[PDB]
């Protein structure tokens, strides 16, 4: 199961960096969402928010132009679309592409590092390393 | 022959992250087949001249052979003092502190991720072990899904 694998990767990222929230989106070449896995938000809150992300705002930027991005305040970025009603507040941000050499498929991202600090150089390196493993997983599912 | 390019980049990045974050002087990973024969070995922290002097890659013996045989996390204050120790070959850096963990999925283990010589002179911490285990699990995912 691909989503179980992607969830394991999100868990490792969130726990090791010590972020409150973690997520991964995988999309097709038209930018349609194929998979969205996440941790940090209870299902009651999920039910209030409603539909899962479509890959807009800051995530849209990263889908169009895959490369690592860290932000002190996600809502301050020019590409920021804003959260939907009932979504938890989130401030600090780290996002990296989920990719292989040939192609990028998705984005692994974290918000709200514990105790309020920005994501570090070391956090970005770690998250890139985990994402690469997810990149291989996604590339394999696309063949198999 | 050579490892799949994406797999190799991923494993090397994982070794680097593990080595960097636990502040190890040296880091390595061996990957083996189902019969436990070593196929690939990637490493960092040893200069290229010392590599030429050592002259042959590890076969998976000593304390590593133990981890290959019995895939479990293993921390040691002095790797050379372990009764499984085979000893380092000529020209190989002396290495004292050791942290090694299986590269695996639920059903099968594929290899070992290992770090030596913490910069602080101290043994690898419990925190160090947890971080390396998670990185090894991602390496396990990579190996399992790697391009045929
Ligand atoms: C738990 C991990 C999550 C993280 C780290 C996260 C993070 C984000 C980020 C960074 C944005 C872009 C904000 C902006 O551009 O201003 C966003 C937008 C959004 N999020 Fe969340 N989110 C998470 C979970 C969820 C969940 C579970 C839902 C739905 C139940 C959700 C629904 C949305 C929607 C609808 C948007 C608007 C843009 C879009 O549709 O892509 N998010 N989120
Ligand atoms: C740079 C990261 C490295 C680490 C962390 C590392 C670690 C180790 C450890 C823990 C042992 C077992 C010691 C014992 O059981 O007494 C060992 C043995 C050995 N190492 Fe290294 N090593 C590294 C690099 C290298 C390189 C680059 C070479 C060759 C160019 C090499 C060649 C060997 C050989 C030949 C053995 C003897 C046992 C065997 O053949 O498996 N090592 N190493």
Swiss-Prot record, chain A:
Functional description taken from the UniProt entry: Member of the two-component regulatory system DevR/DevS (DosR/DosS) involved in onset of the dormancy response. Regulates an approximately 48-member regulon. Required for full induction of the DevR (DosR) regulon; acts later than DosT to positively regulate expression of the DevR regulon during adaptation to anaerobiosis. Characterized as an oxygen sensor; O(2) acts as a switch, with O(2)-bound Fe(2+) protein inactive in autophosphorylation. Has also been suggested to act as a redox sensor, or perhaps as a dual oxygen/redox sensor.
Primary location class: cytoplasm
Record: residues binding heme: 87
Name assigned to this protein: Oxygen sensor histidine kinase response regulator DevS/DosS
Portion held of the full protein: 63 to 206 of 578
Keyword Iron in annotation: yes
Subcellular location: Cytoplasm
Molecular-function GO terms, alphabetical: metal ion binding; phosphorelay sensor kinase activity; protein dimerization activity
Species annotation: Mycobacterium tuberculosis (strain CDC 1551 / Oshkosh)
Domain GAF stretches: 1-138
Lineage of producing organism: Bacteria, Bacillati, Actinomycetota, Actinomycetes, Mycobacteriales
Induction description: A member of the dormancy regulon. Induced in response to reduced oxygen tension (hypoxia) and low levels of nitric oxide (NO).
Domain of life: Bacteria
Other facts noted in the record for this chain: The dev nomenclature derives from the increased expression (differentially expressed in virulent strain, dev) of these genes in virulent H37Rv versus avirulent H37Ra. The dos nomenclature derives from experiments in M.bovis showing the same genes are essential for dormancy survival.
Gene Ontology cellular component terms for the protein in this record: cytoplasm; membrane
UniProt KW Cell wall biogenesis/degradation keyword: no
Keywords: Cytoplasm, Heme, Iron, Kinase, Magnesium, Metal-binding, Phosphoprotein, Repeat, Transferase, Two-component regulatory system
Swiss-Prot record, chain B:
Entry's induction text: A member of the dormancy regulon. Induced in response to reduced oxygen tension (hypoxia) and low levels of nitric oxide (NO).
Range of residues in the leader sequence: none
Organism: Mycobacterium tuberculosis (strain CDC 1551 / Oshkosh)
Domain GAF, chain residue ranges per copy: 6-143
UniProt function note: Member of the two-component regulatory system DevR/DevS (DosR/DosS) involved in onset of the dormancy response. Regulates an approximately 48-member regulon. Required for full induction of the DevR (DosR) regulon; acts later than DosT to positively regulate expression of the DevR regulon during adaptation to anaerobiosis. Characterized as an oxygen sensor; O(2) acts as a switch, with O(2)-bound Fe(2+) protein inactive in autophosphorylation. Has also been suggested to act as a redox sensor, or perhaps as a dual oxygen/redox sensor.
Protein name stated in the entry: Oxygen sensor histidine kinase response regulator DevS/DosS
Annotated positions binding heme: 92
Localisation: Cytoplasm
Additional detail: The dev nomenclature derives from the increased expression (differentially expressed in virulent strain, dev) of these genes in virulent H37Rv versus avirulent H37Ra. The dos nomenclature derives from experiments in M.bovis showing the same genes are essential for dormancy survival.
């Amino acid at each position: 199961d691909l989503e179980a694998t992607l969830r394991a990767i999100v868990h490792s990222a969130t726990s090791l960096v010590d972020a409150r929230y973690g997520a991964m989106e995988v999309h097709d070449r038209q930018h349609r969402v194929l998979h969205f896995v996440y941790e940090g938000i209870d299902e009651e809150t999920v039910r209030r928010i409603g539909h899962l992300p479509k890959g807009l705002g800051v995530i849209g930027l990263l889908i169009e132009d895959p490369k690592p991005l860290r932000l002190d305040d996600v809502s301050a970025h020019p590409a920021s679309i804003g959260f939907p009603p009932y979504h938890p507040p989130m401030r600090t941000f780290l996002g990296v592409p989920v990719r292989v050499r040939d192609e990028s498929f998705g984005t692994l991202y974290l918000t709200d590092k514990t105790n309020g600090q920005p994501f570090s150089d070391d956090d970005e390196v770690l998250v890139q390393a985990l994402a690469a493993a997810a990149g291989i997983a996604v590339a394999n599912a696309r063949l198999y």
